[PDB]
Amino acid sequence: TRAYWHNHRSQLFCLATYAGLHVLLFGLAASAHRDLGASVMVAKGCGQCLNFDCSFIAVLMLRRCLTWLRATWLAQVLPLDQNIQFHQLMGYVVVGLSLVHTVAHTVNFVLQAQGSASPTGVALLLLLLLMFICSSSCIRRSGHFEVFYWTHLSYLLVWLLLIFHGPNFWKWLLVPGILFFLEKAIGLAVSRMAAVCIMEVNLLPSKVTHLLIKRPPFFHYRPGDYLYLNIPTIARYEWHPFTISSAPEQKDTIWLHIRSQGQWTNRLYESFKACNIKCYIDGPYGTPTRRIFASEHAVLIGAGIGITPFASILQSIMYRHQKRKHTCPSCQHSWIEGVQDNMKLHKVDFIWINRDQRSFEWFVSLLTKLEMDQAEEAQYGRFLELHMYMTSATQPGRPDWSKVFQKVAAEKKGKVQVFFCGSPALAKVLKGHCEKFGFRFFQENF
Amino acid sequence: WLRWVTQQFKTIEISLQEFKAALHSFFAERFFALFDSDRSGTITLQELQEALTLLIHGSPMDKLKFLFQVYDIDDPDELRTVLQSCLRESAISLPDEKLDQLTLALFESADAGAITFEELRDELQRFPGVMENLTISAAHWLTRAYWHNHRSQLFCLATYAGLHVLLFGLAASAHRDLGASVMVAKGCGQCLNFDCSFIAVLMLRRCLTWLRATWLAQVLPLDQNIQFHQLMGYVVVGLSLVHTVAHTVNFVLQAQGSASPTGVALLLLLLLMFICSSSCIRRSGHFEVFYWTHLSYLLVWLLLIFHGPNFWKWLLVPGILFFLEKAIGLAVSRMAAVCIMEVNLLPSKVTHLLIKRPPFFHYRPGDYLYLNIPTIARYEWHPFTISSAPEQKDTIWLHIRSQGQWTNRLYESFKACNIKCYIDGPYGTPTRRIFASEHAVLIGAGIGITPFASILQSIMYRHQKRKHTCPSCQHSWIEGVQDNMKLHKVDFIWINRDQRSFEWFVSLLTKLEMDQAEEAQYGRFLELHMYMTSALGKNDMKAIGLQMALDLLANKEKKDSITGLQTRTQPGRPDWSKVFQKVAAEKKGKVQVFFCGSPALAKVLKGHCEKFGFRFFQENF
Ligand SMILES: Cc1cc2nc3c(=O)[nH]c(=O)nc-3n(C[C@H](O)[C@H](O)[C@H](O)COP(=O)(O)OP(=O)(O)OC[C@H]3O[C@@H](n4cnc5c(N)ncnc54)[C@H](O)[C@@H]3O)c2cc1C
Ligand SMILES: Cc1cc2nc3c(=O)[nH]c(=O)nc-3n(C[C@H](O)[C@H](O)[C@H](O)COP(=O)(O)OP(=O)(O)OC[C@H]3O[C@@H](n4cnc5c(N)ncnc54)[C@H](O)[C@@H]3O)c2cc1C
Ligand SMILES: NC(=O)C1=CN([C@@H]2O[C@H](COP(=O)(O)OP(=O)(O)OC[C@H]3O[C@@H](n4cnc5c(N)ncnc54)[C@H](OP(=O)(O)O)[C@@H]3O)[C@@H](O)[C@H]2O)C=CC1
Ligand SMILES: NC(=O)C1=CN([C@@H]2O[C@H](COP(=O)(O)OP(=O)(O)OC[C@H]3O[C@@H](n4cnc5c(N)ncnc54)[C@H](OP(=O)(O)O)[C@@H]3O)[C@@H](O)[C@H]2O)C=CC1
Ligand code: HEB
Ligand code: HEB
Ligand code: HEB
Ligand code: HEB
Ligand SMILES: CCCCCCCCCCCC
Ligand SMILES: [Zn+2]
């Protein structure tokens, strides 16, 4: 659709520039070997393309530097949450190109039939087929992940073999390769790790587990800071990110809501379907959101399914709001302090738009809780308003942004803002509606 | 002891001149007069022996009689003169009315018309232990030291010299066949390829900050990068000189195209930079002229590309790193066209900027910033520590001390507002570990105590923002914790030679302490200790007499006259045993020490913390 193109705009640009660079290198090597007949030309071309891919696959799968890029607007412009299913694509392309390359050189060696390169080539083809065989989803689907890791560790020996197999290859391999080695060196046992222990585990409906891990003493995170969880019982060497779904004012534990959407998280749900186990979290990462707490009548709008950090944001807002309701220990006169200047809000909206509540029952329960929490406080003033839409049947059907925005602009609470977390098809609509009413728009990357 | 006395006497007849020279002042004159018992002006061996026996081996009554004889210049006028001489020796800069009131109080509390010697002893009896502890400061008579601090800089200098002798030998061995000329020429060629390449990667004003926060700042020096860079420049000039003379001797031996033209060009360019980048160009010149002339590093690198055939191999990494960082820094990268709200000139040539806090400017307590002023130096960017707590929402302070050519020129110019300045936002190590503790002991030794001002002001702001008062009953009560500061007490121990440029810090701590001293009746939350070690120690008889009036003035006013502080200022170095014992005596939580100073005290404090079980820290700033 038109909005499919608008959302996938930043994906199609990257895919097309990749295909363009491939055809550029292919044609460059084609021209430089036009003299040879139809077999070493395509072979040299595919060789150049393989150099490029077999080099940059690693930097495509760079873990630590990718997080640092996710914080800036760079995450806004190009999609850097897709690195895994761009990595699998570049792997498939390496396999296809290496296969056609072997076919080209074997046809050439047959035509010439009418060392260091060829044996190393056979071994390289065998290893690439090993990785492409023991790295497909059928290997992690069944509950063996360490087999996958051990087989797919052979990229090291593939790089070794390829160093003294392609003449100009080490030039390509060096910079991404040295970046990869640097990042694997920075990441050591307990560099930013912590051997925290699960204090409890719940199993909410819709196959979502609700980890209550034990808070590490010196672990301080802003609301919305995701962590990279690791559970040896499930998979020893996998590190899947997860968004902390508990307001930082939680001093005892750290929640994590882990929705079943794959092979690791499914393994987690099924395993605990049978608590104190080992976990190794890796720090708080994510965008700092002080623009919300330093605002008035913020309008948090979360669409799609990237709204787990809004649970943390809303719980932190309501905690810091309850933390300004004083009562005299003698007169019992309860008076409400004005702004604390660490949170400057006078109202909040929350418009969660989705297609259903398939996986988010914990979210709906938490929002009813935070709405009933101040429901008796609504006698003088309502702080948190909840607008939840479903668009498939709670006000069913898509909203009317003119209507809800005019309802916002109806009463005067201050400088109305917007914060958004969703599909860029809707982000520009919100930017247009937003500067129409003088609402200072913002957009969040999570 | 007779041998030491004879040696000391032989070391100087010993007239009053050599006496004052060995003793290192009107007190010195009185001592020279009272030492020669025969009033002969020269100190014989017998007179010096008797003086030493009466001072060291003499009883406290003998020392008291000697002090009384030295004090009676013939009363209040003599006491005032002696106290003035002592303060001149003690660097105690007090007002004339302050000294008058001190002399009056001393004459009131000591004279029971004239200070009687019996009355003098009866009053000195109030001084506990000072009787036996009475000892003249002149008797004080009876390198790896700075390497202990330089154990990290000398590491860098040594590895640098090693990585030069390595390249020199590597190039000399490969070309030993050439006779005595091209060997050193090619050695210097390689050393130049290294220095002219890395001298700029030393100047990373952006990546160093990221490295300044890490423990790499603890292991190797990251503040003295400018001096290491100047040193590498000096050795580039020296090496270029020997390299040109090597090639010219080679040429004249052979005579007995890129080489010669680009050689002359690089030689002249490096000489131009070495001339227009000395101290004199900025002491009495335009910082802009310095910047423009010494911008020629681009031209030097360029002409070096097609002069050293394999030089670009070196220049690849540092050149691209330098240009990457320079491109990251753009006109609105993180700059902010901040407007000075107002400036002051606090004493000791320190200027005090109040720059208007940008609306979207959030800094932790103790974050520095790279201030620039297009009026002082158009292009230089100097770092400075925010000396205003974050909870202060109106303006950002900056306490800038004249310690060079930029800051000094700033002070001079303002000595003659709404100007433009381009700060570079917050930096620095995180400081939340100071707030998440109990009875933290912030110790600031040396000249790194500007962020402790910010931290103390933020701590007191939060403390005052956890004191409540009901609008109805007016019942005032306190809270337990605010979840952003869990402290229960703070001890600020501040060692320095003198109050030279920190009287603003003094006037700030006075404010903090007295702002809650009237609440210390039920609980004291911040304890201020201030040590000016250069002041005369409480063991010196003159210093004993001076304290014998300072203490009375304190009891009269309840304010230590030196600073108006509620606490008293303790001259001399601290006995960390007693300090940590007093810390451990009371129980306010898990003690945590913090520190910012020279490693010489870092090791002492780490040893004592292991002795007393306190989790010593040392923040990097
Ligand atoms: C910052 C962030 C926070 C997230 N928080 C949550 C959360 O709280 N709850 C939740 O249910 N999901 C969350 N996800 C998405 C995802 O479900 C988990 O991150 C995790 O990747 C699931 O692993 P999986 O076994 O299902 O992956 P697979 O089933 O093996 O892979 C299928 C999908 O998972 C993605 N994926 C696989 N490995 C990774 C990886 N290492 N990093 C990122 N994506 C990966 C693939 O791109 C694809 O979309 C988050 C993603 C990100 C980027
Ligand atoms: C994080 C930090 C915070 C500081 N805060 C203060 C403060 O609040 N008040 C204060 O009086 N001083 C402070 N200084 C020290 C110093 O006075 C200033 O940093 C300032 O840069 C000195 O300028 P100058 O022109 O006098 O130096 P110059 O006269 O130009 O140089 C002489 C000395 O200054 C150093 N220096 C010169 N240029 C720089 C530069 N760009 N960056 C760092 N050092 C340089 C040299 O290494 C040498 O030690 C701080 C230093 C650092 C590293
Ligand atoms: N960098 C990128 O390229 C990014 C891409 N994405 C894209 O996000 C998509 C997520 O799938 P999905 O979440 O289904 O798509 P959406 O993100 O469009 O669904 C989000 C919600 O917005 C609602 N919505 C869309 N337009 C309007 C409107 N005009 N008025 C009111 N409500 C509206 C939809 O309702 P209904 O479902 O009823 O239409 C849906 O429930 C992925 O396909 C991915 O490609 C995500 C992030 C960034
Ligand atoms: N990593 C490094 O190499 C660093 C080095 N420095 C050092 O900072 C120094 C600055 O001069 P300065 O700050 O005077 O050097 P110091 O830090 O040694 O002097 C600072 C204060 O510490 C006091 N002091 C020193 N040793 C003791 C002790 N054993 N017991 C009690 N008090 C003590 C001094 O008292 P008194 O003056 O009375 O002796 C002085 O008041 C430079 O010489 C430099 O070497 C600075 C930063 C880091
Ligand atoms: C270069 C070479 C190479 C190649 C060819 C490849 C190829 C591939 N691949 Fe690879 N990978 C790689 C190299 C590679 N690769 C690396 C290096 C990585 C990273 C890992 C780590 O870090 O450990 C990866 C990673 C990876 C991953 C991740 C895991 C997680 O989750 O953690 C995946 C899934 C993949 C898949 C794949 C596929 C499917 C393919 C096709 C065959 N991979
Ligand atoms: C990785 C993937 C891969 C694979 C599998 C392969 C496989 C192969 N191969 Fe190769 N190659 C390659 C990649 C490859 N490859 C490269 C990259 C190169 C380089 C390119 C250029 O040219 O640059 C080559 C190159 C090459 C050559 C050329 C030589 C040189 O060194 O120069 C030849 C002959 C070949 C053959 C071959 C064969 C026969 C095979 C199978 C057995 N290869
Ligand atoms: C060519 C190369 C080079 C050389 C040889 C040099 C050499 C030198 N240098 Fe230099 N620098 C440089 C390159 C250089 N350089 C750079 C690149 C820089 C940085 C700048 C910027 O960043 O802008 C500097 C920077 C610099 C500075 C800084 C400024 C401020 O304060 O901020 C100074 C002072 C200097 C000095 C010097 C000296 C004294 C010498 C000796 C002559 N230095
Ligand atoms: C800047 C500093 C510098 C300077 C000034 C110079 C200056 C000079 N120089 Fe010199 N070089 C150099 C640095 C230099 N340089 C280098 C670095 C090189 C290279 C070395 C290698 O091996 O790398 C050379 C090189 C050179 C050579 C060899 C060959 C080529 O490379 O082409 C020669 C012959 C020369 C000469 C010379 C002369 C004659 C002069 C003066 C005029 N050198
Ligand atoms: C099939 C989807 C392709 C998406 C391409 C994403 C590119 C991510 C680049 C990440 C660089 C670190
Ligand atoms: Zn009351």
Residue identified by tokens 């072979």 is: A43
Residues preceding discontinuities in chain B at C–N > 2.5 Å? 12, 24, 74, 112, 142, 256, 416
Neighbouring CB atoms inside 10 A of B590's CB total: 12
- Given an 8 Å threshold on Cβ–Cβ distance, is A331 in contact with B362? no
How many residues in total does chain A contain? 446
The DSSP result for B400-435, as a single string, is EE--SSHHHHHHHHHH----EEEE----S---HHHH
- Given an 8 Å threshold on Cβ–Cβ distance, is A328 in contact with B483? no
d(CA B268, CA B395): 49
d(CA B22, CA B136): 13
d(CA A198, CA A59): 33
A231: amino acid identity, one letter: I
B-contacting residues in A 247-266 (Cβ below 8 Å):
249, 251
**Alpha carbon of A357 to ligand 3 centroid (Å):** 15
Packing angle, helices B96-110 and B76-90, rounded to 10: 130
Closest CA to A260 of A307, A209, A311, A204: A209
Closest CA to A303 of A388, A400, A392, A208: A388
**Tokens coding A377:** 């406080």
**Alpha carbon of A282 to ligand 3 centroid (Å):** 30
Closest CA to B423 of B468, B471, B473, B385: B385
**Tokens coding B140:** 């004080």
- Nearest CB neighbour to A328, from listed B432, B436, B475: B475
Closest CA to A257 of A302, A318, A212: A212
Nearest CA to ligand 3 atom 20: A304
**Alpha carbon of A14 to ligand 9 centroid (Å):** 7
Closest CA to B248 of B265, B262, B260: B260
d(CA A35, CA A39): 10
Helix, strand, or coil (residue B335): coil
Contacts of B436 in chain A (CB under 8 A): 218
| Rounded-to-10 torsion of CA A374, A377, A380, A385 | 10
Q: B400: Cβ below 6 Å to ligand 2? A: yes
Contacts of A295 in chain B (CB under 8 A): none
Residue identified by tokens 């990595």 is: A87
Q: B204: Cβ below 6 Å to ligand 7? A: no
d(CA A446, CA A302): 10
d(CA B617, CA B621): 12
d(CA B44, CA B9): 8
Nearest CA to ligand 8 atom 38: B263
Q: B247: Cβ below 6 Å to ligand 8? A: yes
How many residues in total does chain B contain? 621
Beta carbons of B379 and B369 less than 8 angstroms apart: no
Handedness of CA B457, B459, B462, B463 (dihedral sign): negative
DSSP state of B296: G
Closest CA to B571 of B529, B540, B533, B530: B533
The closest ligand to the CA of A333 turns out to be 10
DSSP state of A413: -
Helix/strand/coil (H, E, C) string of A56-109?
A: HHHHHCCCHHHHHHHHCCHHHHCCCCCHHHHHHHHHHHHHHHHHHHHHHHHHHH
Q: A65: Cβ below 6 Å to ligand 9? A: no
Beta carbons of B538 and B64 less than 8 angstroms apart: no
List CB-based neighbours of ion ligand 10 within 5 Å: A 328, 331, 333; B 470, 472-473, 475
Q: Looking at ligand 2, which atom is closest to the CA of residue B383?
A: 19
Helix/strand/coil (H, E, C) string of B460-502?
A: HHHHHCCEEECCCCCCEEECCCCCCCCCCCEEEEEEECCCCCC
Beta carbons of B266 and B196 less than 8 angstroms apart: no
- Nearest CB neighbour to B472, from listed A220, A290, A331: A331
Whether B472 has its CB under 8 Å from any CB of chain A: the answer is yes
Closest CA to B564 of B516, B513, B527, B523: B513
Q: A85: Cβ below 6 Å to ligand 9? A: yes
d(CA B369, CA B427): 7
**Tokens coding B563:** 């600073």
d(CA B550, CA B569): 10
**Alpha carbon of A357 to ligand 9 centroid (Å):** 29
Q: B533: Cβ below 6 Å to ligand 4? A: yes
- Sequence-distant (6+) residues with CB within 8 A of A105 are A39, A43, A118, A121
The upper half-sphere exposure of residue A301, i.e. CA atoms within 13 Å in the direction of its Cβ, equals 23
Whether A73 has its CB under 8 Å from any CB of chain B: the answer is no
Neighbouring CB atoms inside 10 A of B40's CB total: 11
Handedness of CA A39, A42, A48, A54 (dihedral sign): negative
- Sequence-distant (6+) residues with CB within 8 A of B78 are B71, B72
Beta carbons of B406 and B351 less than 8 angstroms apart: no
| Rounded-to-10 torsion of CA B500, B504, B506, B507 | 140
Beta carbons of B540 and B135 less than 8 angstroms apart: yes
- β-strands B420-423, B336-346 pairing: antiparallel
- Sequence-distant (6+) residues with CB within 8 A of A46 are A26, A97, A98, A100, A101, A104
- β-strands A417-421, A298-303 pairing: parallel
B524 burial (CB, 10 Å; 0-12 / 13-18 / 19+) is middle
**Alpha carbon of A36 to ligand 6 centroid (Å):** 16
Q: A430: Cβ below 6 Å to ligand 3? A: no
Nearest CA to ligand 2 atom 35: B226
Beta carbons of B193 and B310 less than 8 angstroms apart: yes
Phi first, then psi: what are they for A329, rounded to 5°? -65, -10
Q: Best of B317, B431, B466, B468 to disrupt the A interface by mutation (most A CBs within 10 Å)? A: B468
- β-strands B440-445, B592-596 pairing: parallel
d(CA B600, CA B576): 14
Flag whether B100 is marked binding: no
Closest CA to A306 of A446, A128, A145: A446
Beta carbons of B446 and B500 less than 8 angstroms apart: no
The upper half-sphere exposure of residue A85, i.e. CA atoms within 13 Å in the direction of its Cβ, equals 5
Residues preceding discontinuities in chain A at C–N > 2.5 Å? 114, 274, 393
Helix, strand, or coil (residue B538): coil
Contacts of B471 in chain A (CB under 8 A): 333, 335
Chain A nearest CA to B602, separation (Å): 24
Angstrom CA distances, B355 to A176, A415, B25, B70, B377, stand at 44, 26, 46, 55, 18
- Given an 8 Å threshold on Cβ–Cβ distance, is B473 in contact with A341? no
Whether B362 has its CB under 8 Å from any CB of chain A: the answer is yes
Residue identified by tokens 């020996």 is: A157
Neighbouring CB atoms inside 10 A of B519's CB total: 14
**Tokens coding A103:** 């076919």
DSSP state of B586: S
d(CA A136, CA A85): 12
Method: cryo-EM
Q: Best of A191, A215, A331, A340 to disrupt the B interface by mutation (most B CBs within 10 Å)? A: A331
Neighbouring CB atoms inside 10 A of B11's CB total: 10
Residue identified by tokens 């205003």 is: B388
Give, in degrees to the nearest 5, the angle at Cα B580 between B578 and B585: 90
Pocket test for ligand 9, best of A4, A65, A80, A175 (most atoms within 8 A of CB): A80
Q: Looking at ligand 9, which atom is closest to the CA of residue A66?
A: 12
- Nearest CB neighbour to B362, from listed A218, A290, A328: A290
- Given an 8 Å threshold on Cβ–Cβ distance, is A333 in contact with B470? yes
**Tokens coding A371:** 């709405």
**Tokens coding B115:** 């200070």
H/E stretch holding B615 reads none
d(CA A227, CA A221): 10
Q: Best of B361, B392, B469, B472 to disrupt the A interface by mutation (most A CBs within 10 Å)? A: B472
